[model samples]
Target: MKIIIAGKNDIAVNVTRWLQKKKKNIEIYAICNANDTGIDTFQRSFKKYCKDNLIPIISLAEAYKIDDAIFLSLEFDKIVQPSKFNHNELFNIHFSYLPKYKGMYTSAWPILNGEDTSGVTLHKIDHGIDTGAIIAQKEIIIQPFETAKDLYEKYISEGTSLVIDNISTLLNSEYVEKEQNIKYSSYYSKKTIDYSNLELNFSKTAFEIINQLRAFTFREYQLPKLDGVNIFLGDVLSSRSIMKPGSILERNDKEIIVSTIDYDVVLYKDNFKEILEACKYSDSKYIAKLIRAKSILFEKNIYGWSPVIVAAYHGNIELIKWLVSKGANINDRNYKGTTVAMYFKDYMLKSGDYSGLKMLIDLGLDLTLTDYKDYTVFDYLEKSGNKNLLQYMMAFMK
Candidate 1:
């Protein structure tokens, strides 16, 4: 079958190598944007292979006919227009599981969001961004200190295999397509250099801080920022240093102790100059904003409300109960002007924050409170269409 390989950078190179090795009856047309550094090298290498094998190497604009195309997106930024191809012959691979983390910087977003698992998805390309029918999927457990670059490498390796195995099935059959549940679908935008800044609060545990370090350690993209300053730590070991969040103990070369609102952490930086140099490309401002946002959700004393929002967002029951006992006002309003009870209810229904919702209810939180938008806990639950939660609420009402 004739096939087109529309991609740029390392992903495209890898795919090209694999296809050539297999000796499949396929034709390749490489599509790339002009700005990619890998374009010229890829073209030269591809042309040599084509010449050696007597195969045709055509640009995207010149290729008029294709039976199948693989979009192994690496650094190519343009959206693949659906109108450009026959729907049945087109497939694309993304670095994350669909219906969960969609869009760029998915690897980093999951880490920043404290997710424990991440994966890759190969799906049929459509008009929407990363919204398509799934052909195959695979997942990997995320290491607490893994960076985006780390995950990117993992996904590319695994994802390439998945595509090679499934390409035939996808091109031959009309597989049953499953539309993503919009309620469970989430989109994460591209992160800026500013988004890499690190801030430690005392309320965060050693584990959480480690996650931050792992998520932002690499210098290939954006480096970690601290407050308004770009800082890097190398070969660092951590110990409990302070009990308050947002405190910086030292700026020395060996280590730095940062205080969270409730806990202390020590980070060791053996190569200080190298670490600082890595921070040059990072945006301190965006990193500070994210740090501040997370701090407000997990540490700030806003009538003991932030933890509730966090627990609900993460669907962590144990954390939710702990926050409640720590004086998180069950009825406190959040930035959206919704009380904790209402927030938890909406989270349960709209965002599938089931674990936190159940824990809050068991803690004897009154669910009758309404938000500024006139959405009571009961109202939101009823609208959710979740049969189980609906039944439970009905029983409670009765």
Candidate 2:
């Protein structure tokens, strides 16, 4: 009834503790960080409690030498060849629906390959990649909204339960074992199938491109190529319209509008804060590039300011007039919940333009609308103490 675990993540730490709590005769003899994708340190040591208790923690080779020991591995790098442990019992919580995805990045591949089902298989380890005898398995429906990290977390939940339920049964030599169907098996080596190496291949269908976005997207980790630069695309809700991939529908200083095959793409430019800052205030050509990538209007930036606000700031009379006609909402506040009229006053007063306030007020804006801080047009007028602004402030109907 001695159970030795081999894993290199938070779940590994969880599974080890849960087993010890539930069962009295367990030994977490092995822990590893070797199989990690070199992303960050994966292996975590036992808490001080376990270390004080003197539970065995050794390398994979030493763990393999423990006679009559059963090894439970979670994607560890150490390979135990069949010749060395022919009759030994070994189980790995492989993070894919095996006999399909075998090797590295099992959590990320189903998302990339567009699979609706993800699973965890507790199987008897063999020399082959994820090619083993099944001890137990659990399947979860892949939500369209789920990322690889999201799905990996689910596997941790379902897979840990699978082992807790079946480990004792198999340990007592009381469970049935089924060989994996090799015909359906496939291995994903980093060299062969990399999940992080991404680019926008607008040539592909909307579904394929979207999966690429989901597969690699976990938290702030988003990187898809744009004009040969690694631009991080957060996620895709859907794509609409029939057009070429990588088509520019529309864009502005803060955001670039993009298109995909068979639909228009709406991307979140604000996900990478600094990444979009320089691009957000880019030149007209860059803005126009995003503008064309979209279907009609280039949308607002992450800071919540629309083209109306930017146009007002820079005093682009033509763009201001055009956006006004196009119904850009100037009433919308920016990140600070301050109105565009607020910026319209500050910039114009500082630069001595003195016309921004006049133009907006003349064009018919609500001069009395206060901000989240209750700073209104009259509030600016009261603060500035300028005679001409007072005159234009009366032109507020514009």
lDDT per model vs. reference? 0.57, 0.63
Tens-place lDDT per residue, model 1, 1-398, is 55666655445555766777774666666655555443123122333334445555465544434535544443345666767654455677788878788886776678767898988888767788889877778987886545665677677677778777776675566445676667768886665324534454336665566556656655444455555444343222345554456567677644566765334555544242332222223233422322211212232222323545544544455555554564455555653346666655545666554544445666776766665355776666667656687666545441
What is the TM-score of each predicted model, taking all chains together?
Answer: 0.57, 0.61
Task: Give the C-alpha miss distance for residue 25 in model 2, angstroms.
Answer: 3.0
lDDT by residue (tens digit), candidate 2, 1-398: 67677766655655776776787665567555554442322123333323544666677667756777677786566776756653567778888778888888776788878899978888888877788888778888898756665687688788778877887776778878899885877888878655455555667666776677567655434445555444334334354645456777766444455666665554444333332332324544444444422212323444555566765566555555555665556564664456767666666666677655555666665666775345786676777677676566565554
- RMSD (Cα, Å) of candidate 2? 15.0
- Model 1 lDDT at residue 317: 55
Stretches off by above 4 angstroms in model 1 are: 39-75, 174-176, 191-208, 226-244, 270-398
lDDT of 1: 0.57
